[PDB]
Design a protein around this nucleic acid. Structure first.
Ligand code: ZN
Ligand code: ZN
Ligand code: ZN
Ligand code: ZN
Lengths: 74, 76
DNA sequence: AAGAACATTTTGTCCG
DNA sequence: TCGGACAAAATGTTCT
């Protein structure tokens, strides 16, 4: 289809199992491969759009997981 | 408390009128000069502390202004 | 589709 | 106190 399931920007393909833009693709890989310690400054329900996805990596990562992203998709 | 009034990190001086840390000092200068247009992804009430201050420039910048930071603190 | 390298943006430290 | 340069972290794009 058309839109990233994580941030609603234009998708570039099906990455890690889910339709996402390229920025969310590489965010999720880095998140999964790094150490998890992200902390929301809100209530763990930040809105994640094209502009606001840079705000909260904790909620952006929860949204990647909720969308079903996983490194071993293939 | 030698604490930054914006994020509670260790303050380094009175910058632009307010006891703040090095990071909040330059963040504030950068926000006004670029006349930045920040948007909160919460509720306009994010927690701003040493770690989370990176997460919402909108609430960080709001706390700066509200604490009374002002580029013309001296001129004043 | 996915990984890597390059690029950019955003933030933070150190001087003077 | 304040500014500049440098440095680092965080995000994003191109893969001639
Ligand atoms: Zn996305
Ligand atoms: Zn959040
Ligand atoms: Zn501060
Ligand atoms: Zn906020």
């Amino acid at each position: 289809s058309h839109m990233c399931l994580v941030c609603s920007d234009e998708a570039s393909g099906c990455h890690y199992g889910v339709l996402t833009c390229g920025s969310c693709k590489v965010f999720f890989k880095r998140a999964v491969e790094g150490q998890h310690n992200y902390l929301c400054a809100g209530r763990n329900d930040c809105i994640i759009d094209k502009i606001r996805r840079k705000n909260c990596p904790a909620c952006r990562y929860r949204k990647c997981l909720q969308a079903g992203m996983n490194l071993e998709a293939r």
